[PDB]
Paper text:
Protein X-ray crystallography confirmed that the urea moiety interacts in a bidentate hydrogen bond with the Asp101 side chain in MAP4K1 (Asp112 in the surrogate kinase MST1). Ureas synthesized from cyclic amines, which reduced overall H-bond donors by one (not shown), also displayed more than a 10-fold decrease in activity, highlighting the importance of the two hydrogen bonds for overall potency.
Author numbering: 23 to 38, 42 to 298
């Protein structure tokens, strides 16, 4: 009920909808505030907030609430100071090591296990939608295209996501379920190792045509990568969604199961900031 500027001291812009770092003045907690015009298209803003409000997981970006200020909507969220994994790759101009990827994807998979239990499908898993806080904890972000299964709707059939990362069953007319995110996770693993997903240099509308017919992608330089990492990607990129591994099962994959603690990401985060 209080004016947003009395609750929050807005600091630096982080992004440009438009995102600001801010201090919650009563607790000293740092938050991220997304500001959008109330007259803008709010379709995915409304979707993403509805999904985040239903989530309570250390592996999913928290939503704290919304204010009107003048003719803007302020969306208050958990602050992830290291930014996205794709930001960290770009800023350091370096791909991630196997150990760094195992640690990030362990936390990503715990977030997917939580969403999938709640019958949610992220549908836009990619390095750009995995954020790190300054302590190195990975959180799922951008729920703007997330789907919800129900008692009466056991499958979604909307062709939606970001083409290079989309599962074959999502692209094809057939309905699909939570394990579409596991395919996207496999593409994300390659993206973190190589800096870009398979087919990154071809037209996205051409790539979407080939993903359903092509064999599962593999590493560009297979000799660089352990048997465990190679097998982890192969298991994620099983074309049959019925056969594809779940988040729970991949948390036991040898690539993920022995991931190092978030300390392995300290150098990484320091360099990026
Ligand atoms: C030059 O290339 C583009 C530059 N990259 C970039 O601007 N990255 C970026 C990443 C983010 F994660 C950003 O957003 C955040 C930031 C921190 N902590 C958050 N907590 C929550 C967010 C979210 C906001 N939008 C949806 S979640 C958030 C952002 F604004 C910008």
């Amino acid at each position: 009920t209080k004016q947003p500027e009395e609750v929050f001291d807005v600091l630096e812009k982080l992004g440009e909808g438009s995102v600001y770092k801010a201090i919650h003045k009563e607790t000293g907690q740092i938050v991220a505030i997304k500001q959008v015009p109330v007259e803008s298209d709010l379709q995915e803003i409304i979707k993403e907030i509805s999904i985040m409000q239903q989530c309570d997981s250390p592996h999913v970006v928290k939503y704290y609430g919304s204010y009107f200020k003048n003719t803007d909507l302020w969306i208050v969220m958990e602050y992830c100071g290291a930014g996205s994994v794709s930001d960290i790759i770009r800023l350091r101009n370096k791909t991630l090591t196997e150990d760094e990827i195992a640690t990030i994807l362990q936390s990503t998979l715990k977030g997917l296990e939580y969403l999938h239990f709640m019958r949610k499908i992220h549908r836009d898993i990619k390095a750009g939608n995995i954020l790190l806080n300054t302590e190195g904890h990975a959180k799922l972000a951008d729920f703007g295209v997330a789907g919800q299964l129900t008692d009466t709707m056991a499958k979604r059939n909307t062709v939606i996501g970001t083409p290079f990362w989309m599962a074959p069953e999502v692209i094809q007319e057939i309905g699909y379920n939570c394990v579409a995110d596991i395919w996207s996770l496999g593409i994300t693993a390659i993206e973190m190792a190589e800096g870009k997903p398979p087919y990154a240099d071809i037209h996205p509308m051409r790539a979407i045509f080939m993903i359903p017919t092509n064999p599962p992608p593999t590493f560009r330089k297979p000799e660089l990568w352990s048997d465990n990492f190679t097998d982890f990607v192969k298991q994620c990129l099983v074309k049959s969604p019925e056969q594809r591994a779940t988040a729970t099962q991949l948390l036991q994959h040898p690539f993920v199961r022995s991931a190092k603690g978030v300390s392995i990401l300290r150098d990484l985060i320091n360099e990026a900031m």
